[PDB]
């Protein structure tokens, strides 16, 4: 990751703000209102990101438990697949003799 | 079967006795394979038993 | 779980500040710089928390976030995987039990030597 995307969005917003303030000496009241609306939209996006982070942290321990269970299940499935491959090789691949 | 490797069957070489021994070996191999599949795949004796059974059949 | 409460409080405070300063600010518009600094501080705090906790950040959450869908699909997939794993474990246990029972029955009906072998040596 979240830090990567957070820093990328922050750098993009900073570059946009710098490019918009470079020509600040020619901004009117309508331009100020448009900038305020853009800042409000950015704040709404940040609030939505914070709400998403909160919803993800509210189910983070369960997510970690499910990931550990999935890893254990993948290990068990790999062991079962190896056993099945050995049985198949012993029963239908080495019966030439 | 009595020369080259360990000789377990006696000089009788009875058809019924050999068939019962082969059936017991196959049952033991299947039981070991099932136990390995159920508990843990850390047992590789199943493939060795299957190769031994194939050599005995040959 | 204080990061979520802190983020919610920061968002509420930013919304209140925007609603209060929605008027005509004659001074320099420092609101954008203040929001950028607050976002940078929040990102740094979240990184510090994730490094102190050292949680296993998976790629599936990031993929589902970049895709633009809900985590309900991932939850259903994990539930189906857990159900399939439980069913496979139950099937393996039942197959092992049936194999043991059939071997014991065949030994008792044919040769007790194999039964004694499977019961003591195995």
From Swiss-Prot, chain A:
Cellular location(s): Nucleus
Placement of sequence motif LXXLL motif 1: 20-24
Tissue distribution of the protein: Ubiquitous.
Source domain of life: Eukaryota
Chain ranges passing through the membrane: none
Assembly mode: Interacts with GATA1. Component of the Mediator complex, which is composed of MED1, MED4, MED6, MED7, MED8, MED9, MED10, MED11, MED12, MED13, MED13L, MED14, MED15, MED16, MED17, MED18, MED19, MED20, MED21, MED22, MED23, MED24, MED25, MED26, MED27, MED29, MED30, MED31, CCNC, CDK8 and CDC2L6/CDK11. The MED12, MED13, CCNC and CDK8 subunits form a distinct module termed the CDK8 module. Mediator containing the CDK8 module is less active than Mediator lacking this module in supporting transcriptional activation.
Annotated function: Component of the Mediator complex, a coactivator involved in the regulated transcription of nearly all RNA polymerase II-dependent genes. Mediator functions as a bridge to convey information from gene-specific regulatory proteins to the basal RNA polymerase II transcription machinery. Mediator is recruited to promoters by direct interactions with regulatory proteins and serves as a scaffold for the assembly of a functional preinitiation complex with RNA polymerase II and the general transcription factors.
Family label: Belongs to the Mediator complex subunit 14 family.
Protein name: Mediator of RNA polymerase II transcription subunit 14
Source organism of this protein record: Homo sapiens (Human)
Classification lineage: Eukaryota, Metazoa, Chordata, Craniata, Vertebrata
UniProtKB/Swiss-Prot annotation, chain B:
Transcription keyword on record: yes
GO molecular function: transcription coactivator activity; ubiquitin protein ligase activity
Post-translational modification remark: Constitutively sumoylated.
GO biological process: positive regulation of transcription elongation by RNA polymerase II; positive regulation of transcription initiation by RNA polymerase II; protein ubiquitination; regulation of transcription by RNA polymerase II; RNA polymerase II preinitiation complex assembly; somatic stem cell population maintenance; transcription initiation at RNA polymerase II promoter
Subcellular location: Nucleus
Keywords, comma-separated and alphabetical: Activator, Isopeptide bond, Nucleus, Phosphoprotein, Transcription, Transcription regulation, Ubl conjugation
Subunit-structure text: Component of the Mediator complex, which is composed of MED1, MED4, MED6, MED7, MED8, MED9, MED10, MED11, MED12, MED13, MED13L, MED14, MED15, MED16, MED17, MED18, MED19, MED20, MED21, MED22, MED23, MED24, MED25, MED26, MED27, MED29, MED30, MED31, CCNC, CDK8 and CDC2L6/CDK11. The MED12, MED13, CCNC and CDK8 subunits form a distinct module termed the CDK8 module. Mediator containing the CDK8 module is less active than Mediator lacking this module in supporting transcriptional activation.
Family listed: Belongs to the Mediator complex subunit 7 family.
Entry protein name: Mediator of RNA polymerase II transcription subunit 7
Range covered out of full length: 60 to 117 of 233
Curated annotation (Swiss-Prot), chain C:
GO CC annotations, alphabetized: core mediator complex; mediator complex; nucleoplasm; nucleus; ubiquitin ligase complex
Record GO biological process: positive regulation of transcription elongation by RNA polymerase II; positive regulation of transcription initiation by RNA polymerase II; protein ubiquitination; RNA polymerase II preinitiation complex assembly; somatic stem cell population maintenance
Chief subcellular location: nucleus
Localisation per UniProt entry: Nucleus
Family indicated by similarity: Belongs to the Mediator complex subunit 10 family.
Pfam families found in the cross-reference section: Med10
Protein name: Mediator of RNA polymerase II transcription subunit 10
Biological function: Component of the Mediator complex, a coactivator involved in the regulated transcription of nearly all RNA polymerase II-dependent genes. Mediator functions as a bridge to convey information from gene-specific regulatory proteins to the basal RNA polymerase II transcription machinery. Mediator is recruited to promoters by direct interactions with regulatory proteins and serves as a scaffold for the assembly of a functional preinitiation complex with RNA polymerase II and the general transcription factors.
Assembly and interaction partners: Component of the Mediator complex, which is composed of MED1, MED4, MED6, MED7, MED8, MED9, MED10, MED11, MED12, MED13, MED13L, MED14, MED15, MED16, MED17, MED18, MED19, MED20, MED21, MED22, MED23, MED24, MED25, MED26, MED27, MED29, MED30, MED31, CCNC, CDK8 and CDC2L6/CDK11. The MED12, MED13, CCNC and CDK8 subunits form a distinct module termed the CDK8 module. Mediator containing the CDK8 module is less active than Mediator lacking this module in supporting transcriptional activation.
PANTHER family: MEDIATOR OF RNA POLYMERASE II TRANSCRIPTION SUBUNIT 10 (PTHR13345:SF13)
Keywords: Activator, Nucleus, Transcription, Transcription regulation
Superkingdom of the source species: Eukaryota
One annotated GO molecular function: transcription coregulator activity
